[PDB]
């Protein structure tokens, strides 16, 4: 599942939104964006799938490398930790558009 | 929070996917989509935030007005009931991309 980074380039993250330019199935490419806040949660400071609204607990989001979302997130106790998640786990390039799967 | 309908137009709902054309922060427009199935649940026939996968229990999804999602969802007892939820509560436009917050 996922693996968008293998067929996309010029990816960027601003806030909770990922943008990238991806290869289409029958040739050519397309630029699209997807909000990651709908599909990533913060759980005691760690980014996890199967949830939403990590941005309520996190700040300074960045794209590290070709597919990692990095951020500083608030733990249950209230202090922050550095955390990351590999977007290639579930963000795919479906015919030129970024999708969660 | 939310209020995407104030800066977007030509919105449409297909299944659980909302598509709309939104103005970017400094001008210009972008058409994007967000899969509402990631952020809306259906509990005993009623659509609600703070959950996911409402489409598993619902049919006949439609956009009502500029910002409401309407559908028919299955109650625990078995029968379907009409239900609606206002997407403007938690779907926003950030620089041309639909986002959950």
Whether B95 has its CB under 8 Å from any CB of chain A: the answer is yes
Which neighbouring-strand residues pair with A86?
A: A68
For domain B1-101, the CATH class is: mainly beta
Classified as helix, coil or strand, B87 is helix
Rg, C-alpha atoms of chain B: 14
For the sheet with B29-35, list strands across it. B8-14, B17-23, B29-35
Q: Go through A27-60 and write b for each residue having 16 or more CB atoms within 10 A of its CB, e for each that does not.
A: eeeeebbbbbbbbbbbeebebeeeebbbbebbee
What is the residue whose two structure tokens read 């700040």? A59
Whether B19 has its CB under 8 Å from any CB of chain A: the answer is no
* CA separation, residue A41 to residues A30, B34, B96, B98 (Å): 28, 17, 23, 18
Determine whether B33 is exposed, middle or buried from the number of CB atoms within 10 Å of its CB (0-12, 13-18, 19+).
buried
Q: How far, in Å, CA of A16 to CA of B11, rounded?
A: 22
Contact B59, B16 (CB under 8 A): no
Classified as helix, coil or strand, A71 is strand
Complete DSSP assignment for B49-78: SS---GGGTEEEEEEETTTEEEEEEE-TTS
Whether A61 has its CB under 8 Å from any CB of chain B: the answer is no
Classified as helix, coil or strand, B32 is strand
Nearest to B38 among A19, A52, A56 (CB): A52
Q: How far, in Å, CA of B22 to CA of B43, rounded?
A: 31
Test A33 with B94 for CB contact under 8 angstroms: no
Give me the phi and psi of B36, to 5 degrees please: -65, -15
Determine whether B74 is exposed, middle or buried from the number of CB atoms within 10 Å of its CB (0-12, 13-18, 19+).
middle
Token readout for B25 is 């922060």
Q: How far, in Å, CA of A92 to CA of A25, rounded?
A: 13
Resolution (A): 1.4
Q: How far, in Å, CA of A20 to CA of A8, rounded?
A: 6
> Which residue in A52, A90, A95, A98 has the most chain B C-beta atoms within 10 A of its own C-beta, making it the best mutation to test that interface?
A52
Q: How far, in Å, CA of A73 to CA of A53, rounded?
A: 12
Q: How far, in Å, CA of B50 to CA of A55, rounded?
A: 14
Query: Across chain A, where does the E strand assignment appear?
Result: 8-14, 17-23, 29-35, 41-43, 46-48, 58-64, 68-74, 80-86, 91-94, 97-100
Q: How far, in Å, CA of A30 to CA of A9, rounded?
A: 10
Test B97 with A35 for CB contact under 8 angstroms: yes
Distance linking the first and last C-alpha atoms of chain B: 7
Domain limits, chain B: 1-101
């Amino acid at each position: 599942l996922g693996k968008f980074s293998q067929t996309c380039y010029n990816s960027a993250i601003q806030g909770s939104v990922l943008t990238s330019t991806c290869e289409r199935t029958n040739g050519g490419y397309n630029t699209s964006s997807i909000d990651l806040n709908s599909v990533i949660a913060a759980v005691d400071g760690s980014l996890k799938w199967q949830g939403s609204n990590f941005i309520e607990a996190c700040r300074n989001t960045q794209l590290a490398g070709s597919s990692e979302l990095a951020a500083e997130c608030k733990t249950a106790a209230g202090q922050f930790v550095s955390t990351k998640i590999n977007l290639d786990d579930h963000i795919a390039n479906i015919d030129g558009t970024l999708k969660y799967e």
